[PDB]
Design a protein around this ligand. Structure first.
Ligand code: MG
Ligand code: MG
Ligand code: MG
Ligand code: MG
Lengths: 203, 203, 203, 203
């Protein structure tokens, strides 16, 4: 079963995300014109493959299962980024602290280019699970693979669950770096766009 | 044995609380008109189900066992909140640092609503184990499921041990968020009461 | 063998100290008029009971074994505190950061009383392993069970290895609390001596 | 096979480096006039001994394997330091935050002498994998066994993989100490050169 393997990988990603101190969250993959996504409320350690929720191309979820309350901005990510095959959302503490300040992460480290440019954006607040929040997410992901969400947390998407988790972890490292330096020096020194342009091509 | 299962769950919660970096503390459940609570002095890794202490409705503990020195504010929690079935107290480092500043945690993140409102209160100091401390705790828990204790730590109560531990962990995340942002910006941006009102209903 | 059991417990304490993120360090017990102490240079994960070093009452170590380079301030602790049966020294990061500022930890939390008073002292710097450093340590431990060492780290002593490790961990928590609050507010609010006097008696 | 044992030790070092929260990175040993080094892109948990890459004395890597994109500054380290047998590079978060400020780590703690002097230098930025970056690294390592790399991370080299990992971990502790104290007091108190001179000889 294709679905069983993917659901197993979603759970592995969830358990791994908590093990790395990154998780609250939700994880999905692109699947058959819709998505497979974690359900609402169930702790990761209690997830079984059976509990993963399919949402079709119309937003109708499987019968008898309640998908993540934030499935709508997973759908927004997939519609915005044709290259996204997996989406990771969490409230990692350093990411979320930066999002409380409503600041993008600037080019403080060359690994910022892993999200596609010279920044991690911070999308404006809207209530979790709403269409307003979805639209902000779609805009933020137009030219970036990851974005902060003001007063909320982090969305990262990539071509595989492993890469989306890796990118989510990388943005959390970037956030910790930014908080640690901002506490000493405001503004934090950044690399110029020429430096990032060079790195972007090397990637 | 009903009591053996509950005592096993109390110990599991304790061991899990230390594994999450949250513990010093004490854990109880509502039971037969009194409570089952961890004993004083015994490290969690040495607790056996036999060592859990029953305190009856009058405050008389089981013969030959010394309950947690802070059992009185577990009793205060149960008397104040009829919906509380489990109480978790710890000195989690971020919670406790905020409590040293004698500040409530404000609405810096929408998950603040998990404790019932727009804030985590910080009750005024009184000596651990005293009636004065119990009264402060009762007042703080009137409209909130968790509270900081000035110069002390954190109390969280919920409908199950798993939910009380989850809430305790959530407040520690909120505290870390507050400390991290306060070090950059004072005051920290907050969501307004309309935003929290919306979130409270979604819960 | 009495010595084999004690050496096994020293190693367990060392491995546990690193597991708690507290270790560089050295651990000893009072033994037969001298001490058993970790050797110099050997990583904790490579220690075998055979490698623990006996130092007699005169400072002569066992033949063929090199004791910890800081054994002299373990000896100072044992001579200063007749109640000390075990000594833990480490360079735990929060303790050591406070010691770099050459500040005592004040009464920011009632658990400060576990070291015997209203403070964790910070002894003045002297080169590791020297007599000058030993004398500073002896003075600092006169009325306290633990002390910081300026530009260095932490010494904690108690009636058992388990209690000395517990106290070392408690001082590291106190140090993290102090650093976290000092970054927001200088000076940090403290409990007054009446409050600590009450707590000291409850202990 | 000599190579199989060394490649096994490289992988063990990598897995251990991530377990200590220090890793992105790359690890090598001096070998047969060139080096054995981790390959590019492969996560440490997926490395097999077969995947370790030999680079000869000329910079020609083994056929069919792509060495770490930063192999050139491993080569720079080996050419600069005849005593280096192993090189560890990572983006440990505290090291990297200090490198974003473009500050050396000064003599805030006597263990700074483990890198050979009174400081951890911070080499000026250049694009990862370039000759310009290699030259900066060579200069920084002339009189030091470890160096920060501006906007990048940390390089540490020593006589064995175990010692290079130990030194890398020690510099990360020093960096965390510096950040923690700098957030309170700028500049941070340091030991004078006489104190470090004494420690250097004791080593
Ligand atoms: Mg969310
Ligand atoms: Mg308490
Ligand atoms: Mg030392
Ligand atoms: Mg690098």
């Amino acid at each position: 079963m294709e679905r069983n393997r993917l659901a197993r990988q979603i759970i592995d990603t969830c358990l791994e995300m908590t093990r790395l101190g990154l998780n609250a969250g939700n994880v999905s993959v692109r699947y058959q014109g819709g998505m497979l996504i974690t359900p609402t409320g169930i702790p990761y350690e209690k997830l079984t493959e059976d509990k993963i929720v399919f949402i079709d191309a119309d937003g109708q979820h499987e019968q008898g299962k309640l998908p993540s309350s934030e499935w709508r901005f997973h759908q927004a990510a997939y519609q915005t980024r044709p290259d996204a095959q997996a989406v990771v959302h969490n409230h990692a503490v350093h990411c979320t602290a930066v999002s409380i300040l409503n600041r993008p992460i600037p080019a403080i480290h060359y690994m910022i280019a892993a999200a596609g440019g010279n920044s991690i954006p911070c999308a404006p607040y809207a209530t979790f699970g709403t269409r307003e929040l979805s639209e902000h997410v779609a805009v933020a992901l137009k030219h970036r693979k990851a974005t902060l969400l003001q007063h909320h947390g982090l969305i990262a998407c990539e071509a595989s669950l492993e890469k989306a988790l890796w990118l989510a972890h990388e943005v959390e490292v970037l956030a910790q770096l930014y908080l640690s330096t901002l506490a000493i020096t405001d503004p934090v020194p950044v690399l110029d766009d020429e430096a990032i342009a060079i790195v972007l091509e090397k990637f």
